[PDB]
Amino acid sequence: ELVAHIVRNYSQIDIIYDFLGFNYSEGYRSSLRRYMEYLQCKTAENVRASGRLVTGDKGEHNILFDYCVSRESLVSGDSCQGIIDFLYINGNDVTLIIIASDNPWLRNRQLPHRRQMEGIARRVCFVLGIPPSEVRIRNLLLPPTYLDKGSIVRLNDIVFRLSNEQSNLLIPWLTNYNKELDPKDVDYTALAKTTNEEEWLTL
C-alpha cells in the first residue's frame, strides 16, 4: 500500500531517490537531466525536445544540451582540459554543468580552462547571433554521486534564474529536501566553493 501511494503521488520520487545518492548503477546524471528538462519545460512555453538537445523559443535562447558523459569520457592517461556533462544557455547567459568525477587527479582535467571558456562563448555568439557584449559564461561544479540542497538551490538560481520561494512553489519537495556535503571529502568542497564563487567570464 505504501509503495502504491508513493508511486501515485511523488511523480519524481525517482529523481529524489537518485539525487540522494542511492543509485549505485547509473548515478544521478540521467535524473538530473530529467529534472533540468522538467524545469525548462515549465519555464518556457513552446518546447521541442530531441535525444540530446531541448529548445524553447527562438528569441529567449532557452537551450539545454547534454554534451556527453564525463565519467566514461574521461580517460585517466590523457591530457585534455575540457569535458563537460551539460550545457545550458538561458537568454544571454551560458553555464557548463559538470558532475565532479570521484577521481581527484581527474577533477582538474575536468574543469575547463579560461581560454576554452572564451572559445565556447565566442562560438555561442557566432551561432546564435547574440552580441559579444552580453555573452557571459559560468562554470558549474556538482558533487560526484549526489546533490546537495545548496547545490540544487544554486543550480536553480543561476541556470533558471528563479528564487528559493519560486523554486519551492514550482517543485513541492525541494522545501524539505535536506542534504549536506559529506565532510569526508574536502577537496570537492574547496573546488566547488572556488568554482561557484568565480565571476561570470564575460567576453
Binding site: 581527484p104 571529502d185 574536502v186 577537496d187 574547496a190
Partner: protein
C-alpha cells in the same frame, strides 16, 4: 591494447629526455618545465591536494595547495651504506668539523629520525625540510662544543638489519640500570612512523632500529 609500467620511474612518469640513460636524474628539468607551465603561487612548500594539508593550523599556514606544482619541490640534491648509515656518518663528520649545515638525504626514516633529533634537542633546526631528495640539518653547539657527542646507526655495518621488540625498547629505556632519557634510540614502527624509545615504551611497541644518538 595496454602496456604496463614496470619500474618506479615509468610508474611515476618520466620523460627520459636524455638519449639512452634510463637512470638520469630529471628532477630539475621537470621542475623548470612545470614552472614555465604556469603567479598565484608562493615559494612556500606546496601540497598536491587539499586533504594532504597538515592538521596543525600554524603548519597549514606555511603550507600551500598547488595542483601539480607541488611536485619536484626542492633546492639541494642527493649527496651501499643505506641512507641511515650515510646520514649518521655525514652528521658525525660535520659535527667533528664544527660546521653549521649538513646536507643529508631525505628518506622517510632519515627525515623522521632527524625530526626526532630536533624534538629531543640535538639539532638546532633544518633547511629545505620538505625536499624529498635531501635536506640540510642546522647543527647546534653550546660553548664551542657540539651538542651531539656520538651518533651511530643500528646496523653498524651497512648490511645487517634488526627488529626491536617491546622488551628491547624497555631494555633501552632502562639501559645499564638507569632510567635512560639521555641517549635516544629511534625505531620505525609497523605503521611507518618513527618514534624514540620513550614513546615506544609508553605505547608498548617496538620496531625496526634506526640509530642511537647523544
Amino acid at each position: 591494447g595496454h602496456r604496463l609500467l614496470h619500474g618506479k620511474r615509468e610508474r611515476e612518469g618520466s620523460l627520459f629526455a636524455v638519449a639512452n640513460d634510463v637512470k638520469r636524474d630529471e628532477r630539475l628539468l621537470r621542475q623548470q618545465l612545470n614552472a614555465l607551465l604556469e603567479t598565484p603561487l608562493v615559494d612556500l612548500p606546496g601540497v598536491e591536494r587539499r586533504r594532504d594539508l597538515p592538521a596543525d593550523p600554524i603548519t597549514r599556514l606555511f603550507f600551500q595547495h598547488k595542483g601539480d606544482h607541488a611536485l619536484y619541490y626542492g633546492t639541494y640534491d642527493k649527496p651501499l651504506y643505506t641512507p641511515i648509515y650515510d646520514f649518521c656518518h655525514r652528521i658525525r663528520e660535520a659535527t667533528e668539523q664544527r660546521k653549521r649545515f649538513v646536507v643529508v638525504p631525505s628518506t622517510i626514516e632519515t627525515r623522521g629520525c632527524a625530526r626526532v633529533m630536533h624534538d629531543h634537542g640535538l639539532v638546532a633546526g633544518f633547511r629545505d625540510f620538505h625536499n624529498d631528495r635531501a635536506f640540510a640539518v642546522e647543527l647546534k653547539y653550546f660553548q664551542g662544543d657540539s651538542t651531539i657527542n656520538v651518533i651511530e646507526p643500528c646496523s653498524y655495518d651497512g648490511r645487517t638489519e634488526f627488529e626491536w621488540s617491546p622488551k628491547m625498547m624497555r631494555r633501552l629505556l632502562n639501559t645499564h640500570g638507569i632510567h635512560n632519557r639521555l641517549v635516544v634510540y629511534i625505531c620505525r614502527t609497523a605503521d611507518n612512523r618513527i618514534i624514540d624509545h620513550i614513546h615506544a615504551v609508553k605505547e608498548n611497541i617496538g620496531g625496526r632500529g634506526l640509530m642511537m644518538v647523544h
